[PDB]
Design a binder for this molecule. Structure first.
Ligand code: AMP
Ligand code: AMP
Ligand code: AMP
Ligand code: AMP
Ligand code: AMP
Ligand code: AMP
Ligand code: CL
Ligand code: CL
Ligand code: CL
Ligand code: NA
Ligand code: NA
Ligand code: NA
Lengths: 330, 330, 330
C-alpha cells in the first residue's frame, strides 16, 4: 500500500499499529523517545518511530494518514490538530463538539440520549444531586436546605449571592459501562465493537476498605484511569445501546459534518435497566485495547480477530479499494 | 441439516445461533420486532426471524428444535413451555425443580451441595443470619435478641405471634462465582465450559461510594443483572466445583428424569475456600456470552473456539450423527 | 522430544501442561490422587499422572524437567525443592530471595523498585501507615499519637517498651495490578505476557455491603485468593512496568545467579500513576491461567495463542534446538 498508517505513541497505538500491520499497511509511531522500545522491541508494531511530538513534514513525506488516539489532543493541543496538514482519519470538527461541555450537551440532547439533568438554581433541587465545586470536593445534596447547609460547611457560603464556580447535576447511581462503537462511512453501517469497564484509582480501591477504617479519614476520591476490564452486557440491553449509537451518528451528520470511525458513550446502567450517559468520547477509547484478538461481539460476525484498531485499518483499506479515501479523511 | 435450531430472541440468542451456524445448522430467532435488527443486521446470526412470542406452527413447519435461553420461561410462562409441541433441547421437567424453592432445596440437598442453612424459628439463631422480608429490605441479625429488636424497628413487630412473610438464612460472606457446566447426554460426560462474575446494579456500584456519603442515605440495595465479567478460579478449587456438577446431574437422574445440556451453580467462595451455592440455573446462563471465542477452560481441551452455544449445537449434531436425537429432546 | 515436561498437580498445571503439549512434549502431572481426573479426564493434558508428592526416581526415569508452579514450595517445602535431583526450569536460588522478607526487600531496593517505606520506630510516623500485628488485625495510624492510642486499644500496649511483634509500613492506596513477565535466557529478552487482577475473599466482597450494615460488626478482612480477572493497563504505563521487570532481572543477575522464565510484580497503581510493589513472585502466577488462548499483549507480537505455559515450553524447545538446555535448568 502507498498509504502508511501513523499514530501518536500513547493511549492505543499498539492496537492501532498492530491492526494496520494485519491489514497490510506500513506503520509509523511518533512521540516520546522514552517509549520507542515499547513499539519497536517489546511489541514490534511500528516500522518507523519518529522521536517528535508532531513531525508533519516527515509524515507527509511518508504518505501517512494519522489515526487519532483517544489522547491525541491532550498531547498536541486542539489548534495544532485542527490545523494539521497530514490527513486525519475521522472528522476533525468533532473534537470541539466532544470536548466543550455545552456543545457536548447539545449533541447528546439532539441525539435523544439520556443524561443527568443539570440544575441552574439550587433552590430547584427536588431529588438527590451531585455538587461539583471547581472529582475534587464532590458531594451529594438531598434538597435545597441540605444543599445550603453543605455549601456553608464545605464551601464557606453564608449568603446565596456568594455561591459561585459550581455545577449541580442529577445524581445517577449505576454500574460503569463503556460501549465501543465503529461507524463505517464506506459501508454506512454502525457496529458494536466491544464493551469494557474502565478501572480507576483510587475509586475502585475504596470498596476494599471497611467503612470503619474509611471513616477515620477525610476521603479524597479520585478517578485516574489505570486500565480496563472486559465485559459483556445482558443481551436485551444491546438494542437500546446500539440505537443510542445510531442517534449520535445521525445527530453529528446534522451538526458537525458527520461522525465516522470509532467512538464510545461513557455512562452507567441503573437498576431499572436505564443507560445514562455522562460523556461522549468521539474517538478510539482505551477499553478497546483488551480486544486485540477480537471481542465477544466481533466474533459473532467475523471469522477472524477484529480489534477497533484492525477495523480502522479495514475501513482505510476498503476506502482505497473503492476509490473513496478522501471521504474518510479530513 | 434437516433440523434447524431456534431460540427466543433474548438472553443468549446471539451466542446460541452463532454456535448453531458454526456447526452447519440453519437458525431461527423468534421474539419482539424491536430486536429483529440485532439478530439480522448488527449480528446476522438468524436466518429466519419470526416476530411472535411463540410461533409454534411455523416452528414445526421449519423442523425447529428450540434451545431454551436462561429467560425462556420468564417470557413465555411455565405452562406454555411445558406443553410446547416443538422439540425442546434439554429436559422440560427440570423447569419446576430449578424454580420452586422447595424442589430446588431438595435437589441441592440430594446432590450434597453446600447451601445456606434455613432457620424456621428466629429463636434458633446462633450465628449471623440474613433476614429476607417479603433484595427488598434485607438485613442481618446476630442473635435472637438482635433479630427481635430489628423486627420491631424495621417491620413493626411487637409480639412474636405477629411475625410473618419472612425467610431467615445463614449469612454467608464470599465473592460471587458462577461456574458454567455442560453435561453431554450423547457422551455421558460433564464439562466445565467457563466461569464468570455477574455484574449487578446497584450492588456493584456502592463500593465506589465512600462510607461517609453512604451513611447520609437509607441505601436500597438492588441486584439487577447488567452484564458479565470473565474469571478463572484458583486451579485447586476446580475439582470440587466439577464434583458438585457431577452430583447435581446424578441427583437429577433420580429425581426428574435427568439433567443434560448447560447449567450453572450460582454462589460465593468464602475465605476458607468453600463454595456455597445460593441457586441452580438449570439452563444456559448469560455469563457464557463472554465466551463466543471459547474460554480459558475450553481452550485446554479443544483446538477451536467452543462457546456453550456452540457446544449445544455440537451435541445436537452428534445426536443426529449417532441416530439418537430423540434422547436429547423433550 | 526425549525431554518430558512435568509439574505438580495444582496452581497452573493445566496451563503448563497444555502449553507443553502444544509444543510437542509429553507431559507428566504429579500430586494428589483426588485431582487425577482434572488432568486426565476433564482436561486431558497429562500423558502420565503420578499419585505422589514428589516421585523423584520415576521422574528421572521419564527424562522429566520440572516446571515449578507458583505453589511448588508450599506443597513440597524449600529444602526438598532446593535438593531435588530432577532438573528444574528456572533458578532454584531465587526461591529464598523471593520468600525471605529481608532478601526480597534487598532485591527490590537493588532493582530500584518503588515499595512501601518501612518504619522501625512508631515515633517516626509522619504520614499514614498500616500496622501489621503478628491480614489479621491490620489497622491504619495517622501519626505517633494515633498509633499509641490504637496500640493501647487494640493490642493492650500501655508502655512503649512493651510493643513487640509488629510491622509498620507506609500505607499506599491504589488499585491492585499484577503484571506477568517472562525473561528468555535463550534470547536474552524480557516480554510482558499478560496482566490480571487477583480476585480475593472476603476483601472483594465487602464493597457489596453498605457501610451501615458493616458498622454493626467487627470486620475481619481476609485476602484468600479465589480467582483472577483479566485486565489491560493504560498504554502509557507499560514502559515503566516493563522497565521495572528489566531492573528486577538485572539485579538478580548480580545477587543470585540470575532470573529467567516467568515472574510477576504484585502491587497497586496510585491515582498519581505510580506502581508501588508489595511483593515479587519469581515464578509463574495464577493470573496467567486466564490466557490459555493468549492475551491482549501476546496477540500484539505472535501469530498464535501464547500462554505463559506455552512460552515456557517454547523456551525449553528452543534451548534443546540450540544445544543449550543446561543453561535454563538448575
Ligand atoms: N500536553 C501534555 N503535556 C504534558 N503531559 C501530558 C500532556 N497530555 C497528557 N499528558 C500526560 O501524559 C501521561 C500519559 O497520557 P495518556 O496518553 O493519556 O496515557 C498522563 O500522565 C498525562 O497527564
Ligand atoms: N451525575 C452523576 N451521577 C453520579 N455519578 C457521577 C455524576 N457525574 C459524575 N459522576 C462520577 O464522578 C466521576 C467524576 O466526574 P467528572 O469529574 O464529572 O468526570 C465520574 O467518572 C462518575 O463516576
Ligand atoms: N413475561 C414478561 N412480560 C413482560 N416483560 C418481561 C417478561 N419476562 C421478562 N420481561 C422483561 O424483559 C426484559 C429483558 O429480559 P431478559 O430476557 O431477562 O434480559 C426485562 O426487563 C424483564 O423484566
Ligand atoms: N444467605 C445469604 N448470604 C449472603 N448473601 C446472600 C444470601 N442470600 C442472598 N444473598 C445476596 O443477596 C442477593 C439477593 O438475594 P435473593 O433475593 O435471595 O436472590 C443475592 O444475589 C446475594 O448476593
Ligand atoms: N504443605 C502443605 N500441606 C498441606 N496443605 C497445603 C500445603 N501447601 C498448600 N496447602 C493447601 O492446599 C490448598 C491448595 O493450594 P494451592 O496449590 O495454593 O491452590 C490450599 O488450601 C493450601 O492451604
Ligand atoms: N503498605 C500497604 N499499603 C496498603 N495496603 C497494603 C499494604 N501492605 C499490605 N496491604 C494490603 O493488605 C493485604 C495483605 O497484606 P500482607 O499480609 O502484607 O500480604 C495485601 O494483599 C494488600 O492488599
Ligand atoms: Cl480512553
Ligand atoms: Cl442468566
Ligand atoms: Cl500465584
Ligand atoms: Na467528551
Ligand atoms: Na434456580
Ligand atoms: Na515474594
Amino acid at each position: 500500500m502507498k498509504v502508511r498508517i501513523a499514530t501518536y505513541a500513547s493511549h492505543s497505538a499498539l492496537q492501532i499499529l498492530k491492526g494496520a500491520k494485519d491489514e497490510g499497511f506500513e506503520t509509523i509511531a511518533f512521540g516520546s523517545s522514552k517509549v520507542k522500545p515499547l513499539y519497536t522491541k517489546y511489541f514490534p508494531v511500528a516500522d518507523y518511530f519518529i522521536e517528535e511530538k508532531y513531525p508533519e513534514e516527515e509524515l507527509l513525506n511518508l504518505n501517512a494518514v494519522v489515526v487519532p488516539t483517544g489522547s491525541f489532543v491532550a498531547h498536541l493541543g486542539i489548534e495544532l490538530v485542527e490545523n494539521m496538514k497530514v490527513p486525519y482519519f475521522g472528522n476533525k470538527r468533532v473534537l470541539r463538539w466532544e470536548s466543550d461541555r455545552n456543545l457536548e450537551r447539545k449533541w447528546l440532547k439532539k441525539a435523544g440520549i439520556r443524561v443527568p439533568e443539570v440544575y441552574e438554581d439550587p433552590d430547584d433541587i427536588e431529588k438527590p444531586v451531585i455538587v461539583k465545586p471547581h472529582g475534587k470536593g464532590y458531594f451529594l445534596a438531598k434538597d435545597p436546605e441540605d444543599f445550603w447547609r453543605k455549601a456553608e460547611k464545605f464551601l464557606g457560603i453564608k449568603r446565596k449571592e456568594d455561591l459561585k464556580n459550581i455545577q449541580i447535576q442529577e445524581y445517577v447511581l449505576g454500574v460503569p459501562v463503556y460501549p465501543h462503537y465503529f461507524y463505517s462511512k464506506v459501508r454506512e453501517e454502525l457496529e458494536l465493537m466491544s464493551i469494557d469497564r474502565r478501572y480507576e484509582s483510587n475509586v475502585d480501591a475504596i470498596g476494599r476498605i471497611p467503612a470503619k477504617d474509611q471513616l477515620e479519614f477525610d476521603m479524597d476520591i479520585t478517578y485516574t484511569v489505570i486500565g480496563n476490564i472486559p465485559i459483556v452486557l445482558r443481551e436485551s440491553l444491546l438494542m437500546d445501546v446500539i440505537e443510542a449509537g445510531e442517534r449520535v451518528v445521525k445527530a453529528a451528520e446534522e451538526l458537525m459534518g458527520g461522525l465516522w470511525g470509532p467512538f464510545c458513550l461513557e455512562g452507567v446502567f441503573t437498576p431499572d435497566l436505564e443507560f445514562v450517559v455522562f460523556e461522549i468520547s468521539a474517538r478510539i477509547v482505551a477499553g478497546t485495547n483488551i480486544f486485540v484478538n477480537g471481542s465477544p461481539y466481533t466474533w459473532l460476525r467475523y471469522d477472524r480477530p477484529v480489534s477497533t484498531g484492525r477495523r480502522i485499518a479495514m475501513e482505510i483499506r476498503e476506502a482505497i479499494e473503492n476509490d473513496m479515501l478522501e471521504k474518510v479523511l479530513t
